[PDB]
Each structure stands twice: as C-alpha cells, then as structure tokens.
Amino acid sequence: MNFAGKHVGFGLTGSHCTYHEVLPQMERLVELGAKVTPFVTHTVQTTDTKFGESSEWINKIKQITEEPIVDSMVKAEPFGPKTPLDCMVIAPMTGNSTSKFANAMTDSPVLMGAKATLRNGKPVVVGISTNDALGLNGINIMRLMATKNIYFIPFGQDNPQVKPNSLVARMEALPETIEAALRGQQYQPVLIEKF
Amino acid sequence: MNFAGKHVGFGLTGSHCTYHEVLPQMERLVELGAKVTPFVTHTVQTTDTKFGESSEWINKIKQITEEPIVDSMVKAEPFGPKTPLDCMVIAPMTGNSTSKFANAMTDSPVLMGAKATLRNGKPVVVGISTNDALGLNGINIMRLMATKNIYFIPFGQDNPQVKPNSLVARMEALPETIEAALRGQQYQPVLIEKF
Amino acid sequence: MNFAGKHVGFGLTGSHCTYHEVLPQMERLVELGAKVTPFVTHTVQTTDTKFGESSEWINKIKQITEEPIVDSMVKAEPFGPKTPLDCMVIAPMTGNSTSKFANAMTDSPVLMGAKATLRNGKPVVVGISTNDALGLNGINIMRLMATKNIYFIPFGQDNPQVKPNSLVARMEALPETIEAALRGQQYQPVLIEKF
Amino acid sequence: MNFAGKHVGFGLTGSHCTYHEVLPQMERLVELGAKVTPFVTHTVQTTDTKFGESSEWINKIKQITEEPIVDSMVKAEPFGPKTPLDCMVIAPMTGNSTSKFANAMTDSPVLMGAKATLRNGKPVVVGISTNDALGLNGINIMRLMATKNIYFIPFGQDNPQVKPNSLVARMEALPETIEAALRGQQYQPVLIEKF
Amino acid sequence: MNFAGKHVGFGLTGSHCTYHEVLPQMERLVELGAKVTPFVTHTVQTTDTKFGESSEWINKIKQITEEPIVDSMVKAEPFGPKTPLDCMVIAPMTGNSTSKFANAMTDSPVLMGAKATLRNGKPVVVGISTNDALGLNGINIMRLMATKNIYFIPFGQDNPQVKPNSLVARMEALPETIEAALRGQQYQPVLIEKF
Amino acid sequence: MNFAGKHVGFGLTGSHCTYHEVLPQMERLVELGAKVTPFVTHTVQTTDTKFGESSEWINKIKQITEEPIVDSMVKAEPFGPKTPLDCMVIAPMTGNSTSKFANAMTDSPVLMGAKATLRNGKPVVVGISTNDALGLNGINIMRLMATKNIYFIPFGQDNPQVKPNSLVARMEALPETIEAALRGQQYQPVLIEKF
C-alpha cells in the first residue's frame, strides 16, 4: 500500500472537535506518501481574528501537511480543471453534508472538492457519521453507495441501544478504502461491527 | 389532555411576522403544563443590536416561556444526549424547511432540534405552511408523513382558487396532534377544510 | 360543459365489483357527447369462456358504449400514433396501478392507454382509491400530481378513524375534472371531504 | 416471549427451495402460541395438478400449521377489514418483492397481506435476501426501514468478497423481531455479521 | 415573437463572471419588449461597499434594465401576490441551484422568484449549466423536466471527452423557450449538440 | 475492437417486431468473436405450440447464435454463480423494462440476467427505446446512468415534434458501448442526434 505521487483531498465536515478521529488518518496518508490537501466548510480566518485565537485543530492540520487549506469556493474550483485530485476523501461526513452531497448540492468548499473530483471520473471516499443514517438519511446513503465513483469507508452502528439510527465509519479503514477506490472498487466488508 | 412534566420543543421557521398564528398555541401548551423550549433559525442578537430594536415576536416568546431560546447549533445539540425533549414541534414549517427536513439536511437550530429528537425515537410534529406543498414539495411532505416518528398537524388547502398548491395546518389542532403523537399516533382526520 | 366530438378513454383497475362507483360516470360522459373507449387490465374472454358466464360489469359497459373494450397491449398501442384520445381517465386507480403508473411501468392495457396519451401531450385524469395512499403510495401520488399532463379527480380520506391512510376520489367530480384537464388545469378544490 | 392469542401472517417469496431457512421459524412461532397464516405468491394448485406432484415445501407448511394457505388476492384481501393480523412477516423477501413493496405495488397475495396489515396500523416484519441489496435495491430497503410500521429482521452481508451487494437476514432472530415490532420498536442491533 | 407587455424575471446563479453568456439574452428580451426584472442570489451591496468597487456585471445589468435588482427574500416575495411575473427565467442554473430547486428548497432570492411564479401556475424556464448534470444531478434535472410549469432551454453535452457529465444550455435559444413556455409548451428539440 | 473469449448476454424486451433494429448488432458481436447468449421476457414455446408457428424473430436469433435462448427465471439464475457473463446487454429496453430495472424489480428472465451480472460487479449496457423517456421515465433513466456498472448506448430524441418525450438509442453504437463498458467507462458522446 503506497500513495507516492498521489494527490488526495481530505475534507472535514461538522464540529471542529470531532476531527481527532480523522487527523491521525490524514497523517497516515502523508506518511504513506500522499500529497494531502485539506478542505474545510468555512473560512479559517476572518479580518477580525487575533494571534493565538485559532483553534488547535487548524494548527494540527498545519503540522500534518503544508498544502494550503481549501476553505472557499474560489480555492476549491480549480481542483476540477487545473489541479485535479486522484481522490477526494470526506471524513467525517455529517448527516447534513450527506444529504447535501446525495442531492447534488454543492455549497461548501468540501462538496465542491467532491464535485470537481467526480467531474473527472475520479473517486470520492466518504466516512459517514450521523445519528439519522438509518432514518431520514438512509436513502441518501444508499443512493451514494450505488453511484459511480463514490465509495464508503466501512461502517456500522456505533450504539444500537441508545442511538439506533446512528452509523459511523471505522476511520482506521480509510487508507485501505482509498486503495480499493483508486482501482475502481468498494473495499469489503463495507458493513462492520463498530467497537 | 395534560402535558404536565413534558418537555416540548417549539421551533419556528420562516418570516418573523407569521408567528402570530402559532404563539397562541405555544401559550396553550405552557397553560396545559408543558415545559416549552423555543427554537429559531437564526441568532436572536448580533454584537451590533441595540436596546429596544428587538422585534415584538421575541418579546412575545419571552412572555410565554422562560426557557432560553435555542438559536444556534451549539445550543440545539444537547437536546440529543443531555436534555432530551418528549416532543419537538415545528410550526410554521415553511417550504424551504420542509424540503431540508425531508432530505435530511440539518443546518438550522430548528432542524437540529428535530434531528436530536428523532435520534431518541421521540416524536416530531410539523405544521406545514407553503404555497408549493402540492407542487415540488409534495414528495417531501408525503415522505415525512410516512416516516417513523413524524406527525402532521391536520392541514388543507387554504385558497384553492388563488394558490392551488398551497397547504397550511390548522394550528388550533396542535395540542391534540401532540397528544396523539406522544402515543405513537397520527391524529385524525389529518386532512381538513381550511377556514 | 360539452364533450361533443371528444374521444375519452376510460380505464378501470382493481376488482370488477368496485366499478359500480364509476360506470354511472362513464354513462354521463357518453350523455354529454363523448366517444368513450373502455380500457381494462386483462382479457375479457378466454378460449374457455361460456355463454352467460361473463360478469355483469362487462355487460354494463357494453350497454353504455359500443366502442370495443381495449383489453390487450396490441389493442392499446394504436391510441398513440393512430387513434389518439383527447383524454384518458383511470378510475378507480388502485394502489398497485398508482405505483406502477408513478414509476413508469406500463404493463397493462390501461397503463398503455395512459402512456399513449401522455406521448401526445394529452391529459390523463386519475381517480385514486387505495388504503395506503398516505402511507407507501404517498410519494407516488404526489409525484403524479406534480407531473405534466396528469390531473386528479378531487379526493379525500374516506374513513380516517378506520383506514387512516386511505384516499378515495369523489367520482361525481369526474366530468368537471376532465373539463379542466382539457384546458390544461387541475380542477379545484382537489382536496375534498369524502361523504 | 409469548405469542399466545396472536395472529401472525407468514409470507414466503422467491424460489420454493429457499424456504428451508424460514420454515423452522414458522414452526417456532406456532410453538410459542401464535396462530400462523401462510401467504404465498402464486396459486398452490392448478386444475391440472396430480396426486403426489405437490412439492415438499407445501406439505411442510401443512405439517406446521392448519391455517389455509393464502395463495390468491381474493383470499388475502379480508385480512384488512375482516380477519386482521397482529403482524405480517415476509421472509425471505426477495429483491423483486422488496422493490415492489417499497414502491407500493401490491400484486401478489403476500404483498396484499402486508398492505392489509399496514392499513390497520399493524406491523410488518421483513427478512431481506437479495444480492442487489447494496446496489439498486438500497434505496428501497432504506425507504422501508424508515417507514411507519415496517421492521427488519437483523441482517448483514452474507459473502462480501463474492457477492458484495448481498444482504441476508438472520432468520433465527425472527421471533425477537416480531416481539419488538408488536411494541412499536425495531429490534437491535439491526445490523449483524452473517455467519 | 413579441414580449410587449410581458413581465419576465431573470435570475442569475453561480459565479458573477459566467454571466457574459446570458446578459446578451437579457438584452434581447428587453429589445423584444419585455419588462425584465433581474434576480440575484446575494445582496448586491454591504454597508461596507465603496464607490467604484461594484463588479462590471452589476453595471451591465443596470445598462440593460432599470427594474430594481431583486437581491433579498423580502424583495422577491411580492412577485407571488402583488407583482406577478408572466415568466421566470433562471440562467445560468448551477448544479447547486438545480438540486435546491428540484428538492423544493427556496433559500435564495432567485429560487423565491421561481416559487412565487409557480404559486400562480406561471412558467419557469431554466438554463442548466453544471458538470454533474448526468451524474448526481440527473434525477433532479429529470424531475424538473417532468414537472408542471417548468421548461428547459435546449441543452447538450458541452465537452463529452473532458467533462462527460456536463450539460449546458444553448443560451441563444432562451427567447424561443420563453415563447413556447408562455403557451404551455416545451420548445423542441430540447436536446441539442453544443457548439 | 475484439470480443474473442467474451461471454455477452443479449436481452430483448418489448414487441417481437422491434428486434429488426438490434439483431444485426447481435450478429456483429458474434462476428467480432463474442459468445452471445440471448435472453427473452417470456417462454419461447408452450405445450400447445405447432411446427412452423414460431415467429421469424426466434428463427433469426437461432441463425445468429447456437447458445440456448434464456426464456425462464430458472435458466437465467445460473448466470450469477455458475456461468457468469462478461457483459449483459438489454436492447431494446422498453419503458416498462426501464422502470422495473431502475426500481430493482427483477421479474423477467432479461432483468434476472442483468441482476446476475451486477451481482458480480460486471457491466450492463442498455439501449433505451420509450416515448416517455423525458416524462415519467426520466428519473429512472438518470438513476441508471449514475449507477455503478450500468452504461447506455448513446441515445437521443427520435422525433421531437411528434413524440417530444421519446428517447431511442443508436443501436449501431452497441459494440463500441460494450468495449468501453468492459473498461469501466461510459462511451462518449452519450447524447447523440438520432437520424
């Protein structure tokens, strides 16, 4: 398993404090040789922002990869025609992002990265994480699972008694999922037992 | 009919000046003993906002219930794991909110309240109010009507000659709809003749 | 209201013994001057069939109109290119027929009549009658209601306490629905109170 | 766990030789006290049929339960208004039956049993078994999983390397799934590891 | 072809620098006699904005038509009950706008113009322009194409080898598409060969 | 372009007399070296059938290929686990077959061949031919176009003035479409101008 020479986009959705489960996977991809471009859902700074106010997570991304963080539509768009990715990852993918992605809405820098990658016939790999995955998001998920060029990090119910509709990916399986996606395949078993 | 001990969330969507049809129903729930938490789609104040600039509707909510208005994602999220509602109401539910809700988008404090309530298997009760309900919103509405744990305040065409696609709930039926939802039932007749 | 010169197809779906609610409407159309062609879902005779074995309903159709009953795909198909209808009615339209029609299946003579009429941009008017209309059929119904050239005989819940998902058309409104459909309009109010 | 006094319908879909995985579960329900009515997708005899020609599976059903096999639309229909079930099971539910059920088609005695049970607000429990469950059937499955009164026998991928889209229920979990469905609940974990 | 007396709304979605393909068509409508109201997706000025900072495109709209630019929900809403359009155009319609429109979301001034026009039974004409039109947006597009009162400027693949999912309208066909829409018809051929 | 060693299934749907447009393409595949198995939607003989009663089309298939015609579910099923195809073609694919296929119904030998091929991750290539393709079938078509392992023989409107919703494949492009499908690609341009 070797991503030398590969340009992988890594988009993060949802609350900043849930990224401790995926940043170690971003770090593994860089260690396996990938050039990793981070994508995020909002601007990382306002005119207003002061010296050491930036949350830890941004600093952590900057310690993993020197690729500029894509945090605007303008910055995301060239990943279609100019600087194409070999693969785009979205992890964690929240319920809101899942239903936007599944319904062809593309109103965040992350979803624009995904759209720009799909434009070229290249793979998008998603790590779901939502408590409505077996409820209102079920059709969205299964729509994506069946769609050309879209692949899922293996997933399962994380707490069936307390959150019976919740599905969450095994983030440790991310590199393997990318490796199979780059060959045009869904990595298997896609359904796993979480913890 | 008695809601003593019950924690009901009451989310408002759409223009602030359409809430005169639902605030009297919020007031009835409090009078019937419910603890009512209001949810709204945007922040109720900016840094900028001055003394008596706040619109009447906010003041009116504050006269009905002392529960803090949930006007942010941060404030809405604990209604899943920490402070669960027995029922969430969304009334009025606009066409835009209807199609976001039906498609699993959860990008407002109101929709997060609904998602957090559905996470726990608890009921959400909606009062539709849109002029495209029998047009592009029809599938969204019927999707929701058939979905586990989602119930509709009885509704009908409010002006068939002038707005032939428009459906609006009879807001006076809200408490009865909550009472049936808390038993796992859709209150009937769900189709009524408006005015 | 005058259908002189108009060629209206009248398809019947579901059990033969439910047609007592629509045959009087077929008779009114003929009395208002329409040329009415009946369409049915299966062959009206097998090689096997004997003299007075044919059910009353067939005889009743034959007393209303002398147009040959279209009971096969071969017989239905020319209503596209050769003998086009000005309007096709499907009443009663069962839940099974509703979900086939809504999903573009066309495997009965009735649905082929509808397809052949839609091919030409001409109206199809449906009278629903199913106990799952507000359940699994809801999306199918609302899909059809929003689709070009498809119109609904006004309908409502026929027994909300006992069959809460059931919607049935007011068959007496059929001619009026045809009249509005021929002008490109849905007759209003489309939602009525049944009995 | 006790089904004394309960009338459970048990519909079988697909090839006759796949019923060896569900007949032992039909037998457990009878042993736990249920009155079990079998439903099947076609007529069990033609005029033509001879003495010992009937396949073993029919004989096996007849050894488990003395309730007449419902093998026609006429026989299935009274399970709505006259002889209502407390629960309807469909197991195995093939891909074809899954997509008919999910799309509101009701053109077999089994699907009519399910429709007649849903008419009354009563539960239907399904055991999927199709090699396209994570492909074209994915949306159908997730639609059903989210729909009022429909519940799934826990399921999983039965051979991810060879049939990566295949999901099959753990049929041994059927009684437990019925028990939770009768209380209005999906039995959990709904996602399991097959064999 | 003459639009004298006609009030046509012209909404623009997506990047400001893609409007050079549609402004000449806005200009033709005014030259053919239409009163053209522009609709845009965001506010055209902030408190902050300075003298000659406004992008060329705004100035260009202002040279074509003196109707105030509708750039807010408040400004768009009266096009339902007070100042109804005879037709609303959305061109270019981006992938994001397409999937919002198709899913009944109405959270921009442009989509509110479209909703307000559909409320009245009046036509909306769309010019698609997205690189995912034959991918994730395909169902949205075909949903709209089949929906009452919605019509498409003829379109085709603009670069099948490089962007195989991309569909873009022939903007030169816009007036003809409006003319047919005003008669209740889709202008044909709707599928063309781009450049 | 060489199909030596390749096992291609060729399913025919719709009226027997429309196969003159695809049998020459079946013949080209055999001439290019493919082993071609025909699939059809019904049994090719009844007990009843007499000597020279069989329609010309059957004889014509038998002159092109000696592979037994798969005309039953029993015969189609082994193309999953025992005798897998490298590709399955469905041409012509009627509107009825399109909406069954798109909705995961698998109730004909042709659709079972397609299901059995998709089970293995292998390509299915479809040639649409229906007068409702841009109407009620639009979502079905676009669903299939976006689905893993499904590819379309290039298609277009065959008579936009007379049948404005009609799409039909250019059957001459079938081999090229198979060649690209076997590499995991949709052959381009997929949208063409018919005749």
For F30, the token pair is 């055999």
Q: Going by C-beta distance under 8 Å and a sequence separation of 6 or more, which residues neighbour residue C25?
A: C91, C171, C172, C174, C175
Site of tokens 């949930």: B70
Interface check for F102 against chain D (CB to CB < 8 A): the answer is yes
Superfamily name and number for D2-195:
Flavin prenyltransferase-like (3.40.50.1950)
Please report residues of A whose CB lies closer than 8 A to that of F185: 121
C95·D103 Cβ contact <8 A? no
For D102, the token pair is 């999910």
CA atoms within 13 A on the CB side of D143: 23
CA distance E132 to chain A (A): 6
What are the contacts of F27-33 at 24+ separation with CB within 8 A?
F27/F64, F28/F174, F28/F175, F29/F3, F29/F174, F29/F175, F29/F178, F30/F64, F30/F65, F32/F1, F32/F2, F32/F3, F32/F4, F32/F175, F33/F2, F33/F3, F33/F4, F33/F5, F33/F6
Q: Is E41 left (phi over 0), alpha (psi -120 to 50) or beta?
A: alpha
Rg, Å, chain B Cα set: 16
Please report residues of C whose CB lies closer than 8 A to that of E148: 146-148
Please report residues of F whose CB lies closer than 8 A to that of C118: 132, 135-136, 165
Please report residues of B whose CB lies closer than 8 A to that of A164: 121
DSSP A96: H
Resolution in A: 2.1
**Distance (Å, whole) CA F48 – CA F45:** 8
**Distance (Å, whole) CA D13 – CA D128:** 10
**Distance (Å, whole) CA F11 – CA F30:** 15
Q: Are E91 and E181 in contact (CB under 8 A)?
A: no
**Distance (Å, whole) CA A116 – CA B71:** 34
For E193, the token pair is 């060969």
Based on the number of CB atoms within 10 Å of its own CB, is C1 exposed (0-12), middle (13-18) or buried (19 or more)? exposed
**Distance (Å, whole) CA E144 – CA B80:** 36
CA nearest F93: which of F69, F75, F118, F110?
F110
Q: Are A123 and A85 in contact (CB under 8 A)?
A: no
User: How far are the Cα atoms of B41, C192, D129, E83 from residue C181, in angstroms, in the given order?
Assistant: 40, 18, 44, 27
Please report residues of D whose CB lies closer than 8 A to that of B121: 185
**Distance (Å, whole) CA F126 – CA F110:** 11
**Distance (Å, whole) CA A89 – CA A171:** 11
- Paired residues of C181 in beta bridges: none
For D111, name the nearest residue in chain C, comparing CA atoms only.
C96
- Paired residues of C156 in beta bridges: C168
Which one-letter amino acid corresponds to residue F109?
A: P
Based on the number of CB atoms within 10 Å of its own CB, is E101 exposed (0-12), middle (13-18) or buried (19 or more)? buried
Interface check for A76 against chain E (CB to CB < 8 A): the answer is no
For E149, name the nearest residue in chain B, comparing CA atoms only.
B135
CA distance D48 to chain A (A): 45
Interface check for F104 against chain A (CB to CB < 8 A): the answer is no
Query: What is the greatest pairwise CA distance in chain B?
Result: 48
DSSP E147: B
Interface check for C14 against chain B (CB to CB < 8 A): the answer is no
E104·B163 Cβ contact <8 A? no
CA atoms within 13 A on the CB side of E147: 30
DSSP B47: T
Using alpha carbons only, give the angle F50, F55, F61 rounded to the nearest 5 degrees. 115
CA atoms within 13 A on the CB side of B194: 21
For F56, the token pair is 């010309």
For C154, the token pair is 């006004």
Interface check for B184 against chain D (CB to CB < 8 A): the answer is yes
CA distance F140 to chain A (A): 13
- Paired residues of A151 in beta bridges: A125
Q: Which chains touch F (3 or more CB pairs under 8 A)?
A: A, C, D, E
CA distance A138 to chain D (A): 5
Mutation target vs E (from B55, B94, B96, B161; most E CBs, 10 A cutoff): B96
For D5-69, strand residue ranges (E) read 7-11, 35-39
Contact pairs from chain E to chain F, CB under 8 Å: 62
Nearest to F100 among C101, C105, C147 (CB): C105
Interface check for F104 against chain D (CB to CB < 8 A): the answer is yes
Interface check for E80 against chain B (CB to CB < 8 A): the answer is yes
Experimental approach? X-ray
Nearest to C106 among F96, F164, F166 (CB): F96
Which one-letter amino acid corresponds to residue E73?
A: M
Counting every residue written for chain C, the total comes to: 195
Cα D33–chain centre separation: 18
CA distance A79 to chain F (A): 21
Cis amide linkage into residue D189, ω under 30° from 0: yes
Q: Going by C-beta distance under 8 Å and a sequence separation of 6 or more, which residues neighbour residue C179?
A: C1, C3, C187
For B24, the token pair is 């009297």
**Distance (Å, whole) CA E155 – CA E171:** 9
**Distance (Å, whole) CA A48 – CA A61:** 21
Could you count the other beta carbons within 10 Å of the beta carbon of residue C48? 6
- Paired residues of E89 in beta bridges: E10, E125
For E86, the token pair is 């005879």
Interface check for C147 against chain E (CB to CB < 8 A): the answer is yes
**Distance (Å, whole) CA D178 – CA D122:** 11
DSSP C151: E
Mutation target vs B (from D148, D152, D185, D190; most B CBs, 10 A cutoff): D148
Using alpha carbons only, give the angle A104, A109, A110 rounded to the nearest 5 degrees. 70
**Distance (Å, whole) CA D152 – CA D191:** 10
Please state the domain extents for chain E: 2-195
- Alpha helices by DSSP H, listed for C33-183, are 56-64, 73-76, 95-102, 109-119, 138-145, 174-182
Mutation target vs B (from A111, A136, A141, A161; most B CBs, 10 A cutoff): A136
CA distance E2 to chain F (A): 23
